[PDB]
Design a binder for these strands. Sequence first.
DNA 1: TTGGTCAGTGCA
DNA 2: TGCACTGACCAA
Length: 100
Amino acid sequence: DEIHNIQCHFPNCNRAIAWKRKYGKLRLIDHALVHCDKNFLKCKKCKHTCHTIRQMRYHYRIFHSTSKMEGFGVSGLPTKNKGFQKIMNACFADQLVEMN
DNA sequence: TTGGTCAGTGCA
DNA sequence: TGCACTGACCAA
Ligand SMILES: [Zn+2]
Ligand SMILES: [Zn+2]
């Protein structure tokens, strides 16, 4: 369970993500969403939507300073959506197989 | 300012 | 096991 870099397989993406098993899937999903033009992340306190989990972290920090960010793991994401799955499998298909 | 990254981990 | 959340460095 030592940190190893996982190369993103999105076309022309040169980013690798440092990864180990305790981390789980979320930071890989989060990087895959950088390549996504849909807005699958929906705020639970207002109508705002955005592309990545990280952007939603920044949204709660700035716009909902007294709220706890909740339900933004795998279990709370639209993992059965076909467009979502396409982006995931374009980036980290090997690591995001058992996502559902 | 925005937020992509690393690093981290208690508990089911 | 790995989920789903924490704090923080630093590029743009
Ligand atoms: Zn990538
Ligand atoms: Zn909001």
